[PDB]
């Protein structure tokens, strides 16, 4: 049910890949306070609802089309974004990509449709201008040879 | 691993269903292989193969978005160049290199694909019906020819 | 105590005063059973079947193919085999062979969009070219050479 | 222990590890060889003719017209140390069926091309230059395999 | 402190995407009739020739 | 299902009597690597597809 610079709705699928920056003693020691004690899953619910908060801004910050073409520009905006504030957890995305971009709403399958009638008048004239010539043969071929036949069948009967 | 793509989306929209596959391995360098080895150590190929899977789709799913289907299944050494390009260096921090990637499969519900080809059917086609034609000429004339001698 | 192998593999030693593993392709080695271990490789060659359907060509036109391949490991560079080793070592020839069979196709794919139905079946030496030309220089990567590729089946349900 | 292995001329037995070293391959093509019984191994493979049916179905022409032809072919080991050595690499501790397996598809290659190449006449009937080309083509790549289609 | 929701029982929010619906509906069926028009004039010029 | 200079077909048995030039050592060798061990009917079944080509 998400929402875009223009209002219109999507459906999407984000991945990230969330690591400690154990390579800060700094950051590492920041975040141990946080996470000490708790498990790989904990931790992971724990991450996940802040990521949606920055899917949605920059999903609100861009169109559809920028949203499924532009993903390089989407996913710098969203490091961007979200860096910074994973940061003071001590909680860094190695990356983040998107793995599903839908919606019930139409608005997906119109773009393509240009396409669709674009090839439909290529397979339409190729078709007809083939046929016209197997027509304009066939009927020359019918010709001499209806022609000749009546010109043979002519001396049969004389 | 087999990436698969599904309900794509296209430079003019369009969409596709794509299977693409990757060939992969940790990175043989210290400095990555270090990196590499702080996720898995201690884990399975699966958890390797799954992780890296989400990835991989990713880098596709941006690159199918900015090209034709033309380019999609032609293309493919273009694709594969900008697979290179956009995928590498995002991946690499993991530690990880795709030794090679491709794709396997190249389809959708909606028939856009199968137009591209009609046009040649109707060209060998026409080539054929002409030389029957043409040969029913010779044959109806001298049929006829023999006939009226007799 | 010694340890031999045919010409048909290559032998890996690693262990105590033998960091550096030593590779000996058809030989014998003297080694320390408790103290350093001994791994092996096939150097034999697996006859691929490079399957295709639902195929594309130059001017979209789809084909149904089946193309055959040769794979072998190039054991006469002790560099390519090597690389190659650690790409496949302790693997069954059966698990190399889903491995490579899957790259192959890439390129046959590739090669087929730049083709037309016509020279696809008469050029066959030109399609065998194109493929080396554009295929070698990947699977070399992987330390893999392809003896030969051919053609044993080209069809499709349209006339 | 040691053991004398006497062979035909119809065999190539490989040894490796021996009196000369560690790290190599003793060749053997009929005579005999001396092998401890820890120190060098004994493998043997056949340098015999072998001979396949080399089927083609639904081909196609130089004038697109299809075909089904029955090839035959007779082919060997090739009987010189180089080649002999590239070949042995395939088959050593394999079977006839399987080197019978693996050449059919290769003739099968050049079979295809060289029909594309040609029309149902030449096809029947110039089986002197069909044969040229069958040499032609199909010698330097299968060559390669260490293995020689004599006709 | 982020946002995970924002929804309501009455339509408001869902009109403000209306505009775009009809935006990319246009844009889609313009497409398709001028396509129709390039295949059936060539469609009846083939006719004519036969 | 034979095949001519006309194309007409025939249908044809023709008979061969092959055997080993042994009095050529040269040739001799030559064959025998290639049959050392074979029966008559092996042979034979060898040879017979070489004929009909």
């Not at chain 1, 700094?26 to 609802?49: R, S, V």
């Amino acid at each position: 049910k998400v929402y875009t610079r223009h209002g219109v709705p999507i459906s999407v699928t984000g991945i990230a890949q969330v690591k400690i920056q154990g390579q800060n003693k700094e950051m590492l020691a920041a975040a141990c306070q946080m996470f000490l004690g708790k498990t790989e899953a904990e931790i992971a619910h724990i991450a996940l609802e802040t990521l949606e908060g920055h899917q949605r801004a920059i999903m609100a910050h861009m169109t559809v089309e920028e949203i499924y073409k532009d993903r390089q520009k989407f996913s710098e905006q969203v490091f961007k974004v979200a860096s910074s504030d994973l940061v003071n957890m001590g909680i860094s995305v190695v990356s983040y990509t998107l793995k599903d971009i839908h919606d019930d709403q139409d608005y997906l399958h119109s773009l393509g449709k240009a396409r669709t009638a674009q090839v439909q008048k290529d397979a339409r004239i190729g078709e007809a201008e083939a046929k016209r010539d197997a027509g304009i043969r066939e009927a020359k071929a019918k010709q001499e040879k209806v022609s000749a036949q009546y010109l043979s069948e002519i001396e049969m009967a004389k | 691993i087999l990436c698969r793509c599904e309900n794509i989306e296209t430079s003019e929209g369009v969409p596709l269903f794509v299977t693409g596959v990757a060939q992969v391995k940790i990175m043989t360098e210290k400095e990555l292989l270090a990196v590499a080895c702080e996720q898995f150590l201690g884990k399975n190929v699966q958890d390797i193969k799954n992780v890296v899977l989400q990835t991989l789709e990713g880098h596709l799913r941006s690159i199918l978005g900015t090209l034709t289907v033309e380019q999609i299944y032609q293309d493919r050494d273009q694709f594969a160049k900008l697979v290179r390009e956009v995928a590498a260096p995002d991946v690499g921090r993991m530690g990880i290199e795709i030794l090679s990637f491709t794709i396997k499969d190249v389809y959708d519900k909606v028939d856009y694909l199968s137009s591209l080809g009609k046009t040649q059917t109707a060209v060998v086609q026409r080539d054929a019906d002409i030389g029957v034609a043409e040969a029913e000429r010779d044959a109806g004339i001298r049929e006829a020819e023999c006939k009226k001698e007799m | 105590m010694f340890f031999t192998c045919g010409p048909n593999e290559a032998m890996v030693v690693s262990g105590f005063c033998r960091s550096p593993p030593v590779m000996v392709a058809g030989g014998r080695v003297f080694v320390l059973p408790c103290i350093q271990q001994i791994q092996r490789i096939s150097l034999n060659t697996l006859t691929l079947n490079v399957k295709s359907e639902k195929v594309y060509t130059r001017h979209g036109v789809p084909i149904s193919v089946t193309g055959i391949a040769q794979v072998k490991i190039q054991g006469q560079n002790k560099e390519m085999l090597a690389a190659a080793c650690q790409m496949f070592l302790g693997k069954t020839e059966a698990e190399i062979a889903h491995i490579a069979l899957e790259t192959l196709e890439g390129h046959q794919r590739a090669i087929m969009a730049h083709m037309t139905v016509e020279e696809i079946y008469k050029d066959r030496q030109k399609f065998s070219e194109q493929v080396f030309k554009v295929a070698s220089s990947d699977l070399v990567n992987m330390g893999i050479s392809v003896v030969s590729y051919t053609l044993k089946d080209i069809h499709d349900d349209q006339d | 222990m040691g053991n004398c292995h006497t062979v035909g001329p119809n065999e190539a037995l490989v040894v490796s590890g021996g009196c000369c070293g560690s790290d190599y391959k003793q060749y053997v093509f009929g005579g005999w060889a001396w092998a401890w019984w820890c120190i060098s191994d004994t493998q043997r493979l056949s340098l015999e003719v072998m001979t396949i049916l080399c089927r083609c179905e639904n081909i196609e022409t130089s004038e697109g017209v299809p075909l089904f032809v029955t090839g035959v072919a007779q082919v060997k080991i090739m009987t010189e140390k180089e080649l002999l050595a590239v070949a042995c690499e395939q088959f050593l501790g394999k079977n006839v069926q399987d080197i019978k397996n693996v050449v059919l598809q290769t003739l099968e290659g050049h079979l295809r091309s060289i029909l594309g190449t040609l029309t149902v006449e030449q096809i029947y009937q110039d089986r002197d230059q069909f044969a040229k080309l069958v040499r032609e083509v199909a010698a330097p790549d299968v060559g390669r395999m260490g293995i020689e289609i004599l006709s």
